[PDB]
Amino acid sequence: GSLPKWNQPSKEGKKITNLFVNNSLTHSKVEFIPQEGNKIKWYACGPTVYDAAHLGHARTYVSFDIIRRILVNYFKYDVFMVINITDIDDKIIKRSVEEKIGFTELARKWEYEFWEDMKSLNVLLPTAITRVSEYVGDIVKYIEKIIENKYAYVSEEGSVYFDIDEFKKSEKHFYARMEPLSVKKKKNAYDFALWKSSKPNEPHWDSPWGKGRPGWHIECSTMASNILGDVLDIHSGGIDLRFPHHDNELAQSEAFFDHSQWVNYFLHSGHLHIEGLKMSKSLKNFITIKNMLTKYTSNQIRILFLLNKWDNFMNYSPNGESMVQCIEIDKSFTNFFAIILMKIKNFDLNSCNLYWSDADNKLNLLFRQTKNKIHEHFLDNFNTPDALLAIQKLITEINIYMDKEKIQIGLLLEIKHYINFIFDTFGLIY
Amino acid sequence: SLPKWNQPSKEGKKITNLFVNNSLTHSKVEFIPQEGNKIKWYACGPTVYDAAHLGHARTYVSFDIIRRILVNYFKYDVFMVINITDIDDKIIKRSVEEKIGFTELARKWEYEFWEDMKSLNVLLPTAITRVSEYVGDIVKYIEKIIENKYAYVSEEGSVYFDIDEFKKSEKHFYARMEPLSVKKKNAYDFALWKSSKPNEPHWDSPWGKGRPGWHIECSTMASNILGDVLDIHSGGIDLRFPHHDNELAQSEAFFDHSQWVNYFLHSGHLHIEGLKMSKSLKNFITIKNMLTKYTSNQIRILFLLNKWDNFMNYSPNGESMVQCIEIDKSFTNFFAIILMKIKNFDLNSCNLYWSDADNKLNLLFRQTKNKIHEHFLDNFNTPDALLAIQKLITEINIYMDKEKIQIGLLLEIKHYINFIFDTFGLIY
Ligand SMILES: Nc1ncnc2c1ncn2[C@@H]1O[C@H](COP(=O)(O)O)[C@@H](O)[C@H]1O
Ligand SMILES: Nc1ncnc2c1ncn2[C@@H]1O[C@H](COP(=O)(O)O)[C@@H](O)[C@H]1O
Ligand SMILES: Nc1ncnc2c1ncn2[C@@H]1O[C@H](COP(=O)(O)O)[C@@H](O)[C@H]1O
Ligand SMILES: Nc1ncnc2c1ncn2[C@@H]1O[C@H](COP(=O)(O)O)[C@@H](O)[C@H]1O
Ligand code: NA
Ligand code: NA
Ligand code: NA
Ligand code: NA
Ligand SMILES: [Zn+2]
Ligand SMILES: [Zn+2]
């Protein structure tokens, strides 16, 4: 009644870690519970490929790369991940007439550069990549099923529209679950296109309703449903996508499967702002990932994002201001590895005393305590800023111990391996 | 008349449903940390008077695998201690024959031992406890046992553990793990302090110049670092009695409680032509000699193929290593192909539609992860986990040859197999 309901998955037979995540379906932190076993089926919205990627894009996909690494490498979940490529879109069509190199060729060029930029930032490829242009046939069939369930109608011009009012009427369906308050050929203005009749001279595809292109939202519902099925553990994207794009995906997929909950946990990354405004091609305030990488390293860019909670907005100060701290932290990590490897390399088991000293026990106590702190930070909705701080504090105490105390070679090696493990989880490379 | 064992309570603990073969219960029981996700673990180390051999490698590689499974795979927090027995009758005798000081002999063969462990990619423990550095702590430990009335002093200046007195206490049972293997009051009493002949190495004590008894060394060092409850204590099966049963009795007497160790794990021995590989039998192969014939990966595969708590036969002249070399070769060739396909894959010209062949490989992939999880939960069953990896690799090889490849799926599979190989201690 007027408020959307959410069904937490049952805990029986599932991997239970007590991880809590910020779920946009509940607008709260709730315990994460797999639909099945230790498995996480996860779809994340990808770029629309018509130009260079910028630092805002880097923030979203690095943030989700970090979260994936925590889920897999740290918590040992089994993550099946899908990212789409929006290679059919009005922006691409317009840009291709300007560039005169062919529509598929333009989209493929900027998709290729997007993946090169993700690789440069040490962002892992997903399990499956779903390009809209390779799924148009499956999209047409998806729309046919929604129409067959009477949740969409065909205009005379040959477009197909989702029927919001028919969908809401069903007691098992609620439209705009995540942003309820954000709501001539149509029945109602709030109805959105599933199939757009083709304008002349534009790229188009055949369908039962005439030549056209998919509507934006039906692309992601179709592709995610085809690979991951009727219940997604996680669906993600930047916060701007929550409405209309993600709310519309929920309605389409619910209408296709005729059920009530297509996604259990919807995660929305915050935006990178620059001088108070979202970094956007439109505002002409953006910094390309490639330009960023001529001045800073992959590690420094990832540290920038590790210092900001994934689901909050962050301010970026250009001309190196925000990167000053990132460069210092990266510098201290590089210097730490140099020192500890030198101490390990020069340690002589023949001439040492290995008595477990008071200093050895204190360092070990701080070490085990740091493991428990970082565990509680990761359970706390992927709090990397405080886990990074905990690592920095530990490195400060290891540096002191290496300078003066007689070293337990085994304790130093084990601590280095744990720090390596957390840095693999962060996506840092030393 | 039969020893009792108390399973740790599950509240507030990391619970994985791992089952381990506990020599205290002579059965497989669920593993439960004493505190949180922590595992305090002490493992008996070598007696350092000569070169290490393939029997030693079997014990420490087997326990290195188990530690890697516990830490890398299950994400337990393992605090591990391995001792060095550098005071011993064998070291003393060997040092007089060679005409070198006992410390110089022990230090050299401890060094070679760690060099050989590193060559086999065996991780060092958190702490290394040498007897010669803990003698003062051993004396204090013995004083407390005497003060608790569980040990007495002979006229000669030795100290003996008092079995009959220990047994009488209702809270103490002597020889928990091998009950039937059982100047002094009774012959079964064992020395905590041996009065030294004036020509032997010796240390001062309240009872006169002497040396520690064998067993009190390990009780003292383990207690000093890890305390009154060990999650895990391990060693080869020969050490279960008298050495480990005597460690339990001493440490129980020192702390006056009933359970010093929750889970006692005993690796099986490597036999060679039916007899334990032993310096005494002159049937041994040094680790260095083995490594001039086989690689670290191949030697680790040999132990991965044999359950850690069963005995194994080693057939020399390459007979047992044929299979290990074939498996190592197939892992090498698999990684070569999957690494090149990932490196040379071109996103500009590929088609990435998720095909039925992609879906089949993925289902087998996720299914293999679950099989291997159940194998590790089943008392560190690396033989069946290794077989599951081989089967999966067979299907990935087919897919890479014929099907159009999902670059992301191959990359995820590569990372998972790497993760399992890091858990095994294999390096490709
Ligand atoms: N690392 C893992 N790999 C595969 N399955 C897991 C893992 N952790 C938990 N599970 C599954 O989660 C369910 C319950 O977890 P547990 O009670 O921790 O064994 C079981 O069906 C397991 O198969
Ligand atoms: N300035 C930004 N900060 C963080 N994420 C962004 C930014 N701009 C776009 N994104 C995300 O990157 C993805 C691509 O969006 P688009 O800007 O339409 O190419 C979406 O999930 C967006 O929410
Ligand atoms: N990877 C880990 N690192 C540190 N502590 C852990 C880890 N996993 C579980 N624990 C601890 O084990 C206790 C119970 O685990 P659980 O109920 O599975 O969260 C909690 O107090 C946790 O702090
Ligand atoms: N042949 C063997 N196979 C497996 N483990 C052995 C073998 N010989 C010795 N060990 C183990 O290696 C450690 C050192 O024993 P030692 O032979 O006294 O130096 C002990 O825990 C033994 O149980
Ligand atoms: Na409704
Ligand atoms: Na929005
Ligand atoms: Na008794
Ligand atoms: Na024995
Ligand atoms: Zn989308
Ligand atoms: Zn011992």
Question: Is the shortest distance between the CB of A371 and ligand 3 below 6 Å?
Answer: yes
Other beta carbons within 10 Å of A314: 17
Contacts of B350 (CB under 8 A, 6+ apart): B404, B407
Residue A27, number of CB atoms within 10 A of its CB: 11
DSSP state of A70: I
**CA B372 to CA B136: how far, in whole Å?**
47
Contact assignment for B126 to A364 by CB distance below 8 Å: yes
Most A-contacting residue of B354, B355, B373, B414 (CB-CB within 10 A), to test interface: B354
- Take atom 4 of ligand 3 and give the residue whose Cα is closest: A372
- B347: nearest CB among A75, A115, A414: A115
The Å distance, Cα A48 to ligand 2 centre, comes to 9
Method: X-ray
Q: How far, CA to CA in Å, does B74 sit from each of A72, A74, B71, B82? A: 12, 10, 6, 22
Q: Cα dihedral sign for A168, A169, A173, A178?
A: positive
Q: Which two tokens stand for residue B208?
A: 């006169």
Report helix, strand or coil for A259: coil
Residue of B nearest to A344 (CA): B124
Cα–Cα dist B110/B90, whole Å: 14
Q: Give the closest ligand to the alpha carbon of residue B129.
A: 10
Beta bridge partners of A86: A48
CA–CA dist B43, B59 (Å, integer): 10
> Are B408 and A128 within 8 A, CB to CB?
yes
Is the peptide bond between B3 and the residue preceding it cis, with omega within 30 degrees of 0?
no
In which element (H, E) is residue A397 found?
A: helix A384-404
Residues 6+ apart with CB under 8 A from B105: B48, B49, B91, B94, B95, B98
User: Does the C-beta of B239 come closer than 6 Å to ligand 4?
Assistant: yes
- Report the alpha-carbon distance of residue B166 to residue B314 in Å, rounded: 41
* Interchain pair A350, B130: CB under 8 A: no
Other Cβ atoms closer than 10 A to B310: 12
* Encoded tokens for A131: 């390009």
Spell out the residues 6+ positions from residue B220 whose beta carbon is closer than 8 angstroms to its own.
B134, B137, B138, B141, B212
- At residue A289, the 3 state secondary structure works out as helix
- Our answer on whether the CB atom of B318 is closer than 6 Å to any ligand 3 atom is no
CATH for A20-316 (3.30.420.10, 3.90.700.10, 3.40.50.1220, 3.40.50.620): 3.40.50.620
User: Which residue of chain A has the CA closest to B368?
Assistant: A78
- Minimum-distance CB partner of A108 among B108, B348, B354: B348
Edge-to-edge order in the sheet of strand A39-44: A128-131, A78-85, A39-44, A232-238, A263-269
Amino acid letter, residue B394 = T
C-alpha distances out from residue B149 to B26, B155, B164, B173, Å? 30, 17, 11, 16
Distance B237 CA to ligand 8 centre (A): 7
Where is A41: in which H helix or E strand?
Answer: strand A39-44
| CA–centroid distance, residue A99 to ligand 10 (Å) | 76
- Rounded to the nearest whole angstrom, what is the distance from the C-alpha of residue A70 to the centroid of ligand 3? 15
How many A×B Cβ pairs under 8 Å? Answer: 91
Phi then psi dihedrals of residue B335, to 5 deg: -65, -35
For ligand 2, atom 20, which residue shows the shortest CA distance? Answer: A238
Inter-chain touch B353–A126, beta carbons under 8 Å: no
How would you write chain B as a 3-class SS string?
A: CCCCCCCCCCCCCCCCCCEEEECCCCEEEECCCCECCEEEEEECCCECCCCCEHHHHHHHHHHHHHHHHHHHHCCCEEEEEEEEECCCHHHHHHHHHHCCCHHHHHHHHHHHHHHHHHHCCCCCCCEEEEHHHCHHHHHHHHHHHHHCCCEEECCCCCEEECHHHHHHCCCCCCCCCCHHHCCCCCCCCCEEEEECCCCCCCECCCCCCEEECHHHHHHHHHHHHHCCCEEEEEEEHHHHCCHHHHHHHHHHHHHCCCCCEEEEEEECCEEECCEECCCCCCCCCEHHHHHCCCCHHHHHHHHHCCCCCCCEEECCCCCCHHHHHHHHHHHHHHHHHHHHHHHHCCCCCCCCCCCHHHHHHHHHHHHHHHHHHHHHHECCCHHHHHHHHHHHHHHHHHHHHHCCCCHHHHHHHHHHHHHHHHHHCCCC
A314 DSSP β-pair partners? A272
CA–CA separation, B352 and B360 (whole Å): 15
Token digits of residue A90: 């009005």
- Long-range contacts formed by B364-370: CB under 8 A, 24+ apart: B364/B392, B364/B395, B365/B392, B365/B409, B365/B412, B365/B413, B365/B416, B366/A39, B366/A78, B366/A80, B368/B392, B369/A78, B369/B416, B370/A37
Span between the terminal Cα atoms of chain B, in Å = 53
Strand, helix or coil for residue A29: strand
Could you tell me which residues come within 8 angstroms of residue B180 by beta carbon, excluding any fewer than 6 positions away? none
Residue among A354, A360, A364 minimizing CB distance to B130: A354
DSSP state of A209: T
Q: What is the DSSP letter of A79?
A: E
Ligand 4 near B213 CB (within 6 A): no
Q: What tokens were used for B327?
A: 């498996």
Ion ligand 6 neighbours, Cβ < 5 Å: A 240, 243
Contacts of B312 (CB under 8 A, 6+ apart): B58, B268, B269, B270, B271, B306
Angle formed by the axes of helices B321-344 and B382-402, to 10°? 40
Residue spans of alpha helices (H) in A239-357:
245-257, 289-293, 298-306, 323-346
Question: What's phi and psi for B162, nearest 5 deg?
Answer: -100, 90
List the one residue out of B309, B335, B304 whose CA is nearest residue B320. B304
Q: Name B103's Cβ contacts closer than 8 Å, sequence gap at least 6.
A: B86, B132
Tell me if B185 sits within 8 A of B154, measured CB to CB.
Answer: no
Domain boundaries, chain B: 19-314, 321-424
User: Has domain B19-314 been given CATH number 3.40.50.1370?
Assistant: no
Overall size of chain B counted in residues: 428
Would the CB atoms of A372 and B412 count as touching at under 8 Å?
Answer: no
B351 backbone φψ class: left, alpha, beta (φ>0; ψ -120 to 50):
beta
Q: Tell me the ligand closest to A36's alpha carbon.
A: 1
Residues with CB under 5 A from ligand 5 (ion): A 168
Contact B425, B61 (CB under 8 A): yes
The CA-CA-CA angle for residues A391, A394, A398, to 5°, reads 135
CB A255 within 8 A of CB A146: yes
Specified resolution (Å): 2.3
